[PDB]
């Protein structure tokens, strides 16, 4: 058990290093010293005009909302490849894999957004841009509702000071979740998750030897993320109800379908 | 390119399907399987001569063995599909949608390879269960059997070989009008490529065949009707035979078929 955990953790980290475009290590070097700062309409237009970088244009709040969907779609592709590299995730039947991804990606996305964020804003477009928290909060309701809860979570999450190797096991535990609706092989997914959680506590003891209560704090963060996604899906429902001209990407339609 | 397309599909077929039609026709012709034709021969077959939920009765036992072969063939069809150009490029939920509505059409076409008018090869060709015995099972279980033999005899009269079947099965899976497909234009495009490859392949492989390609297009329509009728019998069995188990994968496949 103790010898198999270190190899397991290393395999998952490699799956992480191989599949995600931005690491917290890379992100943290960009945010400590250059990204083009986007803080109003004019700089946002600048960024789109090649300094940094879709359905037909409409308005600024809707354009940003569309760029949020695009990052989700791309992060889902990365999370799908990550999960496939996970031990025995690929042994599940394909429909169980889709179930885990469907109900797990947004929990993992919000955890991973914390890596590319500080209290003042968000790295965008491979870290070549930085969009400020203040500009994001200046958008129109209902679109601005979805913004600040994610910053409030990320600031508290970044306080735990996790690194990419911790995060790789954290995300894997989010995905391999046994109580997802419609899951076929519940005992098999619970088994995989228990191994990942075991590997995670072992990894934390070695990587953060002085850290107080870090494993149960992380388990609590997993419950916070489910609550965060719950509130986020509620706000997406309001956007769908009250902003009928605004489009939702087909993949997000499938994720949010009941 | 188009020959290369067919050769790639053919190799993914030989790589992923343990029993080929060539092999099956060698066994069934005589280049010798234990014949299962009644209760006693079936018992001998289970007692190591040839080879699950707890036993209930004979007709349910065979019904369970039918489910086991579907589960195993879905696994092979999943890997065959994942080896097809641009099937893997679809999103995973679209891949599952195609398999969900495609596997039984492919399964019934592929079962024709291991069948003659008298019965069916079982357990890697080591057994042969007679159409006679299968028809003699209790209703409602026996109802699922004879429409399949009817289809297969006529299907075998076209005298396809494994090279033809590989493209036929690929065309069945990559099917653009499956319910709930996300990227219909991309699936329709892949299907059109397979079908053009098949037309081209049948020209070379069956030069003297008359109307073979449109006959095969008609067999694909016949397969879809055979599966609709089969799905209705399966739902009636779940209604009237509450003690009989249905494998979870089959529960998920038949959940929304009418
Ligand atoms: C740590 C918290 C950061 C909070 C910021 C809000 O970020 C988000 C909130 C919610 C979602 C979930 C989506 C909603 C459609 C889903 O439902 O899938 C995604 C993002 C990700 N946003 C971006 O990456 C982003 C934002 C702006 C721009 C730009 F440059 F245009 F301004 C470019 C990219
Ligand atoms: C012309 C083609 C063949 C026709 C014969 C009927 O065969 C079938 C009909 C319907 C299905 C679809 C399933 C049903 C649950 C689904 O709904 O998925 C599968 C089979 C495949 N049967 C077997 O392989 C089989 C049968 C008997 C035994 C044995 F030895 F125990 F008696 C062992 C294996
Ligand atoms: C192994 C490939 C064949 C799998 C076929 C079974 C697919 O079932 C479907 O899986 C989906 C989750 O992914 C659910 O949303 C659907 O409710 C369910 O019907
Ligand atoms: C790309 C991996 C992430 C996919 C997440 C979205 C999955 O959507 C679900 O796909 C299933 C078909 O497979 C359908 O049965 C469900 O109705 C649908 O909600």
UniProtKB/Swiss-Prot annotation, chain B:
Localization terms from the record: Nucleus
Residue ranges occupied by any NR LBD domain in the UniProt entry: 34-256
Molecular function GO labels: DNA binding; DNA-binding transcription factor activity; DNA-binding transcription factor activity, RNA polymerase II-specific; DNA-binding transcription repressor activity, RNA polymerase II-specific; linoleic acid binding; lipid binding; NF-kappaB binding; nuclear receptor activity
Top-level division of the source organism's lineage: Eukaryota
GO annotation terms (biological process): adipose tissue development; apoptotic process; apoptotic signaling pathway; axon ensheathment; cell differentiation; cell population proliferation; cell-substrate adhesion; cellular response to hypoxia
Expression (tissue specificity): Ubiquitous with maximal levels in placenta and skeletal muscle.
Record flagged with keyword Ubl conjugation: yes
Post-translational modification: 'Lys-48'-linked polyubiquitinated; leading to proteasomal degradation. Deubiquitinated and stabilized by OTUD3.
Keywords tagged on the record: Activator, DNA-binding, Metal-binding, Nucleus, Receptor, Transcription, Transcription regulation, Ubl conjugation, Zinc, Zinc-finger
Cellular component terms (Gene Ontology): chromatin; nucleoplasm; nucleus
UniProt entry tagged with the keyword Ribonucleoprotein: no
Function: Ligand-activated transcription factor key mediator of energy metabolism in adipose tissues. Receptor that binds peroxisome proliferators such as hypolipidemic drugs and fatty acids. Has a preference for poly-unsaturated fatty acids, such as gamma-linoleic acid and eicosapentanoic acid. Once activated by a ligand, the receptor binds to promoter elements of target genes. Regulates the peroxisomal beta-oxidation pathway of fatty acids. Functions as transcription activator for the acyl-CoA oxidase gene. Decreases expression of NPC1L1 once activated by a ligand.
Family membership noted in the UniProt record: Belongs to the nuclear hormone receptor family. NR1 subfamily.
Assembly with partners or alone: Heterodimer with the retinoid X receptor. Interacts (via domain NR LBD) with CRY1 and CRY2 in a ligand-dependent manner.
Name used for this protein in its record: Peroxisome proliferator-activated receptor delta
Species per Swiss-Prot/TrEMBL record: Homo sapiens (Human)
Gene that produces this protein: PPARD
Residues of the full protein shown: 174 to 441 of 441
């Amino acid at each position: 058990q103790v010898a198999d955990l270190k190899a397991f953790s290393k395999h998952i980290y490699n799956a992480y290093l191989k599949n995600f475009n931005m690491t917290k290590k890379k992100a943290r070097s960009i945010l400590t010293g250059a990204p083009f700062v986007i803080h109003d309409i004019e700089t946002l237009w600048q960024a789109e005009k090649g300094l940094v970088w879709l359905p037909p244009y409409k308005e600024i709040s809707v354009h940003v909302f569309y760029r949020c969907q695009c990052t989700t779609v791309e992060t889902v592709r990365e999370l799908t490849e990550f999960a496939k590299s996970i031990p025995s995730f690929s042994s599940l039947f394909l429909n169980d894999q889709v179930t885990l991804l469907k109900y797990g990606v947004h929990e993992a996305i919000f955890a991973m957004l914390a890596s590319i964020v500080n209290k003042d804003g968000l790295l965008v477009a491979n870290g070549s841009g930085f969009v400020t928290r203040e500009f994001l909060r200046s958008l129109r309701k209902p679109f601005s509702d979805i913004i600040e809860p994610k910053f409030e979570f990320a600031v508290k999450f970044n306080a735990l000071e996790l690194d990419d190797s911790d995060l790789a096991l954290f995300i894997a535990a989010i995905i391999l979740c046994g109580d997802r609706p419609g899951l076929m092989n519940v005992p098999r997914v619970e088994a995989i998750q228990d191994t990942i959680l075991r590997a995670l506590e072992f990894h934390l003891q070695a990587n953060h030897p002085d850290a107080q209560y870090l494993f149960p704090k992380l388990l609590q963060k997993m419950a916070d993320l489910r609550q965060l996604v719950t509130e986020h899906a509620q706000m997406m429902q309001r956007i769908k109800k009250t902003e009928t001209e605004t489009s939702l990407h087909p993949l997000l339609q499938e994720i949010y379908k009941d």
